[PDB]
Amino acid sequence: PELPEVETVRRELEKRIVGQKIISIEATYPRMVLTGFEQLKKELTGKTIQGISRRGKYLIFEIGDDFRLISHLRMEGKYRLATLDAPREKHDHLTMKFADGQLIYADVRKFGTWELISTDQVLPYFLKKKIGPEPTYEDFDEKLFREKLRKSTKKIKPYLLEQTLVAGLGNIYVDEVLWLAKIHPEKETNQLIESSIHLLHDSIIEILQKAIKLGGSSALGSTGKMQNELQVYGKTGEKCSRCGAEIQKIKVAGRGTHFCPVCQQK
DNA sequence: CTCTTTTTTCTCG
DNA sequence: GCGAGAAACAAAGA
Ligand SMILES: FC(F)(F)c1nc(S)c2nc[nH]c2n1
């Protein structure tokens, strides 16, 4: 998932597990608990969930005053709320058992991660990863964005995916954003002009906020409607909305890349 | 049978 | 520092 899907999960979890005391925690794949499963089980068992936050694509469980559980779903992670007698499914790895239900984490590819960190270490955790601003008008400053693009020789799509210019874009929404902003994915950022950068900035905010409103593109968060609004991603060979052309797919920095050549010339 | 396809971080030259 | 390619992993499709 990307930021809109993680935000949709965050909102549903916030509605349902805040206030719940953790009765037990079980793992069939403890290796995804990067800080140590036995330590996490000891610290969090018997604690009450106080809230669920998000930063970029990271989910942040607020569990007691002094701990946060930082969860990343990577490529295929999925959460579901199940009854206590729910049968185990093949790719379930972790479960947080409450008195009247359980939160189960599944991940076919086993990429997703859990990290237990103390409350006063959350901001340093994200500083160390150099995560960029949240994609909102209030947080995403166009002036700094423009300066960073000017000083770099990177291609725009890889640079946006690095999470350092702005947080939360993945392969789907970066393709949608560059189509909407009429920018080639291999455009070198120091060749972007101010009016293009302005449109890119606004387009990032607008696409991600619309995606959040529509519940993401498609367990929790599986009821999104943003997939019906995608213009280029996964649409290889189909006609662009700025009509005439067919959507092409190339490889850029090892990622499948969907774009409309006429609309996105360098 | 092989090869390719679908977030983050590391290795290598 | 850089970028390309690979690594972590599983399943499905060509
Ligand atoms: F593909 C890419 F290599 F450009 C890339 N994509 C994503 S989603 C990403 N997240 C952190 N770093 C990242 N690099």
Numbering used by the authors: 1 to 218, 224 to 271
Text lifted from the article:
Fpg/Nei DNA glycosylases are composed of two globular domains, an N-terminal domain rich in beta-structures and a C-terminal domain rich in alpha-structures. To further our understanding of the TXn mode of action, we solved several crystal structures of LlFpg bound to 14-mer [THF:C] (LRC) in the presence of thio-compounds.
The best inhibitor, TX13 (2-trifluoromethyl-6-thiopurine), is a monothio-compound; it was seven times more effective than 2TX, with an IC50appA of 7.5 µM. Using this method, we successfully resolved the structures of LRC with the moderately potent inhibitor 2TX (new crystal structure), high-efficiency inhibitors TX13, TX19, TX20, TX27, low-efficiency inhibitor TX15 and, TX19 in the presence of TCEP. With TXn, there was no clear electron density near the sulfur atoms of Cys248 and Cys268. The guanidinium group of the R260 side chain interacts with the unique sulfur atom of 2TX, TX15, TX20 and TX27, with the sulfur atom at the C8 position of TX19 (with or without TCEP) or with the N1 atom of the purine moiety of TX13. The epsilon amino group of the K57 side chain interacts with the sulfur atom of all 2TX/TXn compounds.
